[PDB]
Amino acid sequence: MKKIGVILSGCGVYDGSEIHEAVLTLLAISRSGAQAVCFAPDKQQVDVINHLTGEAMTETRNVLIEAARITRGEIRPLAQADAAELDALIVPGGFGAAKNLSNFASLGSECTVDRELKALAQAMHQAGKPLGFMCIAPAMLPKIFDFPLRLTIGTDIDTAEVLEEMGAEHVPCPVDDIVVDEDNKIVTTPAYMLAQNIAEAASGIDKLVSRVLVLA
Amino acid sequence: MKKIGVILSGCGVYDGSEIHEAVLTLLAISRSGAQAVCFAPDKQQVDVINHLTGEAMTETRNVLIEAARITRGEIRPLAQADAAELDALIVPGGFGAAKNLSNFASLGSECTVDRELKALAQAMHQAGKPLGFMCIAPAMLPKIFDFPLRLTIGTDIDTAEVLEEMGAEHVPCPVDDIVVDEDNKIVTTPAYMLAQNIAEAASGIDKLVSRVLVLAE
Structure with missing residues (x-):
């Protein structure tokens, strides 16, 4: 039974994890007979957004x-994640990824990543275990x-530019496909950066999870 | 596309809508070529629960x-829901259904249902449009x-008895099947009353959504 770590950043697209992306990632993991082991950093959100109005609360x-x-309720503090007990790591999107897992939303190419997440992903990569990041x-x-x-964030030119400024090779990708860095076993998909509906998001996420499991 | 009204009660199993049930409902509607139209009553939740500890906040x-x-953000107050603009109505579960859409949690067989929801459900049924309730x-x-x-809530002995006390014909049903009151076009399934994982919940929910859509067609 493969163990897939799923890292969340809150509950809702504007201040945490994109709910549809997180639930579709869990569905694909379950459907495939693998176990999702979820974590999230035990800290205060940088903000709370009213999702009806888009304004800060x-x-x-x-x-x-x-x-x-x-x-x-089946989740633990990110501090308790151990790379030796996981076979793959998947990080759903949502603005929480750029606010709570890192400060990319406010710093762009000068941002920094949550230290517990950074250490965990680095340990996973050193053990030759696959990582999957979306949106x-x-x-x-x-x-x-x-x-x-x-990597890929979809087709957004400005976001693509910022990634290239950080040293990555951005590869344009539509919502129903994935981009894989074969040597480093990193799988990325755009999800809600481009999805126009939930079915669209699901087609790309299903492909990402499948590739990650194969790599595992 | 058929317009399927989805009624939510908050965001989270203990004090709102079961998140996996609500998302799986949206997924099945969208995948089947239909349009989800979401609403929730504009009122304060009866409680807020810490989902890590289960404690009231x-x-x-x-x-x-x-x-x-x-x-x-694609949702409106329940007061704006108009039966004439919808082809079917589906109510995902979660404790919010028993706390915000009704007071079943605290009153059981003597409970009452949100007035707007009751009225909208009665209008759909009067028009011969199907309803789907889960969990x-x-x-x-x-x-x-x-x-x-x-109808069904799964197999829970205690809950089934409360339903029979309320006058319903409770039909024991597993997580992967649905129960339909054919004459009244009502479709129910247990979802997380019995599901052990999200794939199991998706199996029953996809069947309910598919039957609701056939009934609307």
Whole structure:
């Protein structure tokens, strides 16, 4: 039974993990007979967004407490993740990826990544285990790995430019396909960077999870 | 495309809509070539639960603002739902169904259902449009319709008895099947009342969505 670590960043596209992407990732893992082992950093969200209006709210929420809603409570602090107990790592998207897992949303090419996440992904890569990042999550890759990688965030020219400025080789990719850095076993897919509906998002995520499991 | 109204009650199993059930419902609607039209009542949730610990929190949240998370902002107040603009209605589960869409959680067989939801369900049924309820959501049916209905919440002995006490014909049903009251076009399935994992929940939910869509066609 393969164990796939799934890293969340809250519960909702604007301040945490993209709910559809996280649930579709869990569905693909389950359908394939693998076990999803979910984590999230135990810290306060950088903000709380009203998803009906798009505006910031005057309240505070904890990343892990909120991410527990997506997993029905089956989640642990990211501090408890151990690369030796996992076969693959997948990071769904959502703005939380650029706000809580890193500060890419505010720093761009000068951002930094959550230290527990960075250490975990580096340990996974040193053991030859596959990583899967989607939507805006791939933007952290050039800050986790100090070596070039072929990746994709879809087709957005400005975002693509920022990734190239960070040293990555951006590869344009439609919503129903993936980009793989074969030598480093890193799989990326655009998901909601381009998906026009949930079925579209699911086609790319299903392909990403499948490739990650094969690599595992 | 058929317009399928999806009613949400918050964002999370313990104090709103079951997130996997709501997303799997949207996935099946979208994959089947139909259009999801989402709503939630604009009112404060009865409670806020820390899903890591299961403990009640000392904060308050709005059902609609939280349900907007599941729908990427694509949702309206339940007051704006118009039966004439919809072809079918589906209510995902989660404890929010028993707390925000009704007070089944605290009143059981003496509960009442959100007035807007009841009215919208009655209007759809009067027009011969199908309804789909899953998990604990079918517990509201005896309080929406004043005639016996064939439905299921799975196999829970206690809950089944409460439904029979409310006048329903409770039909034991596994996670991968559905129960349909054919004369009234009502489709129910257990989802997380029994699912052990998300693939199991998806199996029953896809069957319910497919039957609702056939009934709407």
